[PDB]
Amino acid sequence: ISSLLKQDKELDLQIQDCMREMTSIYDTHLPKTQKVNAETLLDYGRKLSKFSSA
Amino acid sequence: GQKFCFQNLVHVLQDIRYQLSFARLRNSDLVTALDILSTGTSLRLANAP
């Protein structure tokens, strides 16, 4: 019985490993919860530069 | 009057130092600017509990 139980545990661990590897490969992710013109960007950032700075 | 001279000089030197901070310009925080392109301050939200 002890040898055969050890065999069952090992087989359970083998199915474990296969499902583990399939679910690892398929990484499951939740779903995810404008372009810019640089001129208006740069001017805005330089404005902000004095005010976000100490 | 001579003392007044010393002090007065110190005050003028401070004043021009003040104008000095008023004249420099610092490199833009583009990060905050790009965040504000998308209308949030992404920084202040993520950071804050």
From Swiss-Prot, chain A:
Domain of life of the source: Eukaryota
Subcellular compartments: Nucleus
Family: Belongs to the Mediator complex subunit 4 family.
Summary of subunit composition and partner proteins: Component of the Mediator complex.
Function: Component of the Mediator complex, a coactivator involved in the regulated transcription of nearly all RNA polymerase II-dependent genes. Mediator functions as a bridge to convey information from gene-specific regulatory proteins to the basal RNA polymerase II transcription machinery. Mediator is recruited to promoters by direct interactions with regulatory proteins and serves as a scaffold for the assembly of a functional preinitiation complex with RNA polymerase II and the general transcription factors.
Name assigned to this protein: Mediator of RNA polymerase II transcription subunit 4
Span of the entire protein shown here: 61 to 120 of 239
Swiss-Prot record, chain B:
Subcellular location: Nucleus
Top-level taxonomic group: Eukaryota
Name this polypeptide is given: Mediator of RNA polymerase II transcription subunit 14
Record function comment: Component of the Mediator complex, a coactivator involved in the regulated transcription of nearly all RNA polymerase II-dependent genes. Mediator functions as a bridge to convey information from gene-specific regulatory proteins to the basal RNA polymerase II transcription machinery. Mediator is recruited to promoters by direct interactions with regulatory proteins and serves as a scaffold for the assembly of a functional preinitiation complex with RNA polymerase II and the general transcription factors.
Subunit structure: Component of the Mediator complex.
Similarity-based family: Belongs to the Mediator complex subunit 14 family.
Residues of the full protein shown: 89 to 137 of 879
